[PDB]
Paper text:
Dystroglycan (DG) is composed of two subunits, α and β, that are formed from a unique precursor which undergoes a proteolytic event within the endoplasmic reticulum during the first steps of its maturation pathway. DG represents a widely expressed adhesion complex that plays a crucial role in offering stability to tissues, being at the crossroad between cytoskeleton, plasma membrane and the surrounding extracellular matrix. The DG main role is to bind with high-affinity laminins that are central organizers of the molecular network behind specialized basement membranes surrounding skeletal muscle. We have pioneered studies on α-DG at the molecular level, having extensively characterized the structure of its N-terminal domain, which is shaped in two subdomains.
Interestingly, the human T192M mutation (and its topological murine counterpart, T190M, which causes a similar dystrophic phenotype in a mouse model), lies within the strand B1 that together with the strands B2, B3, B4 and B5, arranged in an anti-parallel topology, defines the floor of the basket shaped S6-like domain. The crystal structure of T190M has been determined and refined up to a resolution of 1.6 Å. The overall structure of T190M does not show global differences with respect to WT. As reported for WT, the structure of T190M consists of two domains: the first one described as an Ig-like domain (residues 60–158) and the second one (residues 180–303) similar to the small subunit ribosomal protein S6. Despite showing very similar crystal structures, WT and T190M differ in the conformation of the flexible loop linking the two domains (residues 159–179). Moreover, in T190M the loop could be traced for three additional residues, up to Gln163, with respect to the WT structure, with residues (158–161) assuming a β-Turn structure. Despite the limited effect of the Thr to Met mutation on the neighboring residues, the introduction of a bulkier and apolar group such as the methylthio group of the methionine causes a re-organization of the surrounding water molecules. The lack of WAT304 in T190M is rather interesting, as this water molecule bridges together the B1 and B5 β-strands by interacting with the backbone of residues Val188 (O) and His296 (O), and with the side chains of residues Thr190 (Oγ1) and His296 (Nδ1). WAT304 acts as hydrogen bonds donor towards residues Val188 (O) and His296 (O) and as hydrogen bonds acceptor from Thr190 (Oγ1) and His296 (Nδ1). Such hydrogen bonds are not observed in T190M due to the lack of a bridging solvent molecule that would stabilize the interaction between the B1 and B5 β-strands. The plot of the emission spectra peaks as a function of GdnHCl reveals a cooperative unfolding behaviour for both WT and T190M, with transition midpoints (Gdn50%, i.e. the denaturant concentration inducing 50% of the total peak shift) of 1.45M and 1M, respectively, indicating that WT is more stable than T190M.
Residue numbers in the entry: 58 to 163, 179 to 303
Write the structure that this text describes.
């Protein structure tokens, strides 16, 4: 037998945006071999990533503290008669986490503020696993009508649970805010105003009635729509 070498291409991620890539385990593991996916030189993955061994998906949602380059090892091992894991091969690639998505899914003119809908949640992303972060985005899709990968999810900063610049807004179900808070947002369009915003009853009504929080799994503090400086 002559060993095969598999190269995996490097990836990119953006703070506050879902990350998902397929790992070619069928090329790396000959039949009956055990796959391990970890940070290079460690047993665990970085805190922002999760490995699904049955779908062969590496997925995550980075925070600002995850900015920079993450080396990931994908290795295959033979289980010995004595239960030992005998390493057979390893493939290492990196993922660079960038700081800013500029509220753009990818489309607005550089002359143009982005109209963003934001939902404020009583949650702490730093207390949530990567899978919990992704599941929260998944559960917002019924309300946003935006795909998982086009929503943004970041912590509240400097304890601000409101945006005075918002030209539309409304309440959620929460009466108290126990955690630091999280901001889950998406783009509605470019330099919109109240008359050109789409129908948002599908956000505002479930938010106030508690149906949104019951689906998301976290209390909803409120929602607002504001135009944000282009970047
Ligand atoms: Cl940010």
């Amino acid at each position: 037998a002559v060993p095969t070498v598999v190269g995996i291409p490097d990836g990119t991620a953006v703070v506050g945006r879902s990350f998902r890539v397929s790992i070619p385990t069928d090329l790396i593991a000959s039949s009956g071999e055990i796959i391990k996916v970890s940070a290079a030189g460690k047993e665990a993955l970085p805190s922002w990533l999760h490995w699904d061994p049955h779908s062969h998906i590496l997925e995550g949602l980075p925070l600002d503290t995850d900015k920079g380059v993450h080396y990931i090892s994908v290795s295959a091992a033979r289980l010995g008669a004595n239960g030992s894991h005998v390493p057979q091969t390893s493939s290492v690639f990196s993922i660079e986490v960038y700081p800013e998505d500029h509220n753009e899914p990818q489309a607005c003119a550089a002359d143009e503020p982005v109209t963003v809908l934001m939902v404020i949640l009583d949650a702490d992303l730093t207390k949530m696993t990567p899978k919990q972060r992704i599941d929260l985005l998944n559960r917002m899709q019924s309300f946003s009508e935006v795909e998982l990968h086009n929503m943004k999810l970041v912590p509240v900063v400097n304890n601000r649970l409101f945006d005075m610049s918002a030209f539309m807004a409304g309440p959620g179900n929460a009466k108290k805010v126990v955690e630091n808070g999280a901001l889950l947002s998406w783009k509605l369009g470019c330099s919109l105003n109240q008359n050109s915003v789409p129908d948002i009853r599908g956000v505002e009504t479930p938010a106030r009635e508690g149906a949104m929080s019951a689906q998301l799994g976290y209390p909803v503090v409120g929602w607002h729509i504001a135009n944000k400086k282009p970047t």
